[model samples]
Target: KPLPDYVAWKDADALIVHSDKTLETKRSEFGTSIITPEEKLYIQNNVNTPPESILADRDGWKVEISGVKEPRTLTVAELKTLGLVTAATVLQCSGNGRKYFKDQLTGDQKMSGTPWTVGAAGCVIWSGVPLKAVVDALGGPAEGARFITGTGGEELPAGLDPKLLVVERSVPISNLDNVILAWEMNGRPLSLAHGGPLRMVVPGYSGVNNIKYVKAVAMTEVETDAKIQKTSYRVHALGEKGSPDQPSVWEQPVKSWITTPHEAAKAGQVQIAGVAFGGMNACKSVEVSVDGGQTWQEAEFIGPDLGRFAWRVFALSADLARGTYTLVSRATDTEGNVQPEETEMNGAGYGHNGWRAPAVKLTVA
Candidate 1:
């Protein structure tokens, strides 16, 4: 059964909530592109407590490393000794725009899942030992290995068969240089809520690949048979079959969201703005339309080039003479990928990066 109870942690920056094992970040409270603090980053999980919550100390924490020439265990302290590398990347839930699908569709077109807003994302800095360094330390994997699976040390609820569920997932081994066994966030030690002790940080991949409380990372010839890797995260067209040929979800799509002039705000010369991310590419441009995308005007990106995998904060404004206006923003990537006008319908609301910019309605007086 799903855990319905929840607990809230009141912090100086935002009110962090632990509901059903998911911690939500109050993105509205964030106004800049600086790295999101560890305490303020969003969290999602199917399990109850982080591994550290049970282990009680980092000394007892050890991640089992396998499939390499020399399989062994690496403790948190030992991993840190390899060297700490920091990466500023945008971390977003796969279901980031799940709630907006229902609003954009016709009657009876409903989706079920966490009703997350675009706030499910943030540009955060993760400091950790690089996965490549660790792989090299292990003497590398077998020649045929094509993927690396990361598993967290969290338990399942009562009565669920391990065979029927997958708490672990894998990402392409080809992107090894971009992976990290992160133990810190924004210059601070990882907190339990943010997968303390140690977690996988696979930049440019979906949030799930950044497995929390990571307990194991194994190089493999084939993807793990775990339900998450084989079934759950797979994406297919609306009317398509769940065939083996269907592609599994990995990298996030290029997308943008408008943050300012929030709903029902009195507007005039309104400063409309938000953030845009291009997944593996740097965001090339973002276009805003004050009249519901009838025409597009470029919004200037206002921030440092943190990295290709991190988001660029953007700002644009329009002088309104009064009345209601629908504001929308669309982003383009350096790789020439533009946000689509509609999302490809799937059984699960995985990637909802439709061209619409989380449309905001504002009343100008």
Candidate 2:
């Protein structure tokens, strides 16, 4: 088996390799950029990387469609002919801020799963056809369709049952709107390692819900029963294992953090910059606090507003005398949902965007 070689393409210094399939970008490397480039974006896949030959004919890959009035298999080439649309969205793992839960929610037993600090999340441009367009073209979804179940095409072990290892996720039907099936990443052909050929792009949702190397997509009456959909990625209470009753890691929540001057940064006429985003809504405002959360000054957004699903780069300038300062940022979405101060100590330690979680300290001299 050929293991992935990140040095070939991914920036050697900008990443922290957790495993062969999980490569986390260093948070300090995110320098107030509105769009995370393909090279700098994070990578996390559940299954083994597919063989390189799979990309031999990117346009020829086939995906089976079901539970539509006009159910049929469509090749990547044909899906492209339907139409093209582009949007910017955040691609994040459910456990993007796992480490923060352990750091801030002290006295708790250690958190479960990989302890991602910050790089397990990023914003990127997706170019592809709208999933709603595809559903409409296929005579719209059939009756009783309540969810969209998407299955990946990775090759599992030779003898084991695929049901246990397959990567399949089902999201509520509402995700259909604004969702896309992308073949391009950051204006380039999607690479094999990043779900080349065809990848489902579910805007504002957790990365796990965005199926890669998608092989079968079905609009169904029930959520997928696959192990991944039923037993994994679900956020549960501190002492509980996971169950369908618990809230599954689906839509992302509002999050913001300092990008420049990571920790113990030098101070002297400092300019603070950071990124903020509302998962499914547009970020309305951001405020920076030089003294924890006691007092805050409004920060101005400094870049182009990509969209509701895209992140905004915010900046604040302050002149400081010799002293120590603890900096943090808080964000509120257009829906008026404010970022919280205390994070959930969930079993999965998912979605830790609390202001204190990513706080930074600076030595002004």
Candidate 3:
């Protein structure tokens, strides 16, 4: 109840406890730090958090391997000794800005998943060994493998077929280079709400693809037949449940939002601070508009470039008069992709990165 797992170490203002299961970050509490303080990261688990037994014996936690040349089980301690690396990336939920579908735009109806705001995302430094290292240590994966699937360690309710509710996902193995079995967030070991001992991290991919509390990882010739992998979390037309035929929520898209001048600011040369990311690509530039997207100007990058998968903290100075203005940010990716003004809404309301939905109405007084 004290050091990490369920004591509410965070201040009330820092988080929006939507429910006991989901704890999201507060946009008002966001700072311009390059790496999100582990304290400020969001938490959303598909099932319950891992038991205290698993969280306590972190290094001894075991995960099985299959589809490798030499399949075996390995503990976190053993994996650590094989190879260790650190990388910075954004850990964001698929329904991050879902609240905008009803609150910001004209939906007026709630989405299928959690009605989360932009606070459901955070940039963090993950420490662990490259997934490839583990595969290589086991003499490499089977030659014909096409998908790398991860299974979560949460226990499911009885009476229902386990396959339908289990947290298992299969992603194309082509992205293996950008994957890691992360054991720590920022510097401390991953906490209970965050999947504890180990979680599979797929940089630039949606969070669901980054399996939590990884129980097993394998290379298979095809995607997992689990319900979650076959028909859920896909982007499809409105009024229809998604299927494997539609695009699975794999990679993220270019997006930006104002962090400072959140609700109001003083009448002076105020800093219009925000953050942006190109999703799978490197961010080329970020621009800010004070007059409801009518005009825009570039914002200065404020910190170190933590690689393509990481987000950039940006700022633009503006002298404002006492009036309410709609402040927004537009991001451009190195690949020529620009953040759109209005994103095409989907049935599940997955990716809402529109510059307009996240636009802030700041009252400068």
Candidate 4:
């Protein structure tokens, strides 16, 4: 298994920054003077350095918006025109680089490109235009097509390879309601650092294809590979455990972390916290085992139930003796996809739902 080697677009020729204050200024320079297309180029970037962060923009690809079933563009005000609405959204990264901490405490594994620590994933209330409306006004996808593609933009810097520019990518649209042109997250406008203005959020897919700073929307008669559709991010098999040599390409598999109690066990009541996500369906329920997998119990789950998308907020409670202990939480989705102790493979590393058992240590007298 060849590890993925990635570079940043800010360092590529795909995008140029001249210290401009606005998109218009940046465009004028890019158009008449720069000679590069300045329109909304939905470029799929990879997230290897930090978990849950925008993936790096690797290749430069373009989307055919003309193919979109019904073509419509709405202003920010127009987006708000729909109504006040919110859906639970969990952001997940493809588990391409999770081996660093999945099982071993530490190893010589080169950084998995996405330098995500334990806190890379998150769940929030996403507010914006329902992708259904975009498709509805557009009249739905072409016949026999069940999926829609989302696009991204890239701004490359100087001295980068043209071949390694950036790419336009798409994923199985799943459902019209599965996609959202999110404007507000967690009850506020999104942050540029976290994809502001607009982002195409696929509820069930890995965070890799959930492009941000979108520029265009296109429907295709056939599946295309302008995006990361066919690249290094895919896997070879399912329930496949990646070794130091036979690593997996999909996002790290089903994993969770503790957010409360601060430590493994203490003197007071403890509220164990974390999240779980899968590739084919929304999480139906999350199971937590305090004494290893010896016994499993249901953990409370929170968020929307869109298809193929993952959910967040699975928690448990327990009182334990002060010492070193391991806590594991696993998820089972509506489609009966359970978090595997190991990962399964896909031809393209599309599905990575391995177990991420987190361990905590504490001491009590």
Best by lDDT: 3
Please give the TM-score that candidate 3 achieves against the real structure.
0.95
Query: lDDT per residue, candidate 1, 1-365, as tens digits?
Result: 22232223424346344455565666465576656655456768765664345436764679999988888999988897777688888888887777766565576665666777676777888889998888888898878889989987777666887745546887888878889888788887777766778889988887877888888999988888887777777787543444445677789899888777776555466788878889988899999988888999999988787888998888886777878888888999999999987787786677889766478877777
Error of model 2, residue 277, in angstroms: 0.8
Give the runs in model 2 whose Cα sits over 4 Å from its true position: 1-3, 104-108, 264-267
- lDDT by residue for model 2 over 1-365, one digit each (tens)? 22256335877678787878888888788867698877777889888878768888988999898989999999989899888989999888888888887675557576657789778888889898888888888999999899989999898888997878999999989988877889998989888777887899898998898888888889999988788888778878777877887788898999888887775555567888889999999999999988888989999998899999988999889877778888899999999988999776787788787898787787776
Pairs of colliding residues, candidate 2: none
Task: Give per-residue CA lDDT, model 4, range 287-340, as digits (tens).
Answer: 876665667778886433433444455678766666555566678766576776
- Model 3 CA deviation exceeding 4 Å by range: 1-7, 103-110
Q: In model 4, what is the error at residue 116, expressed in angstroms?
A: 3.4
Which of the predicted structures, 1 or 4, would earn the higher lDDT when compared with the native?
A: 1
* TM-score to true structure, per model: 0.90, 0.95, 0.95, 0.65
Off by over 4 Å in 1: 1-7, 10-19, 51-55, 104-110, 156-160, 239-244, 264-268
Q: Compute the lDDT of residue 168 as modeled in candidate 4.
A: 46
lDDT of the candidates, in the order given:
0.77, 0.85, 0.86, 0.49
The residue pairs found clashing in candidate 3 are none
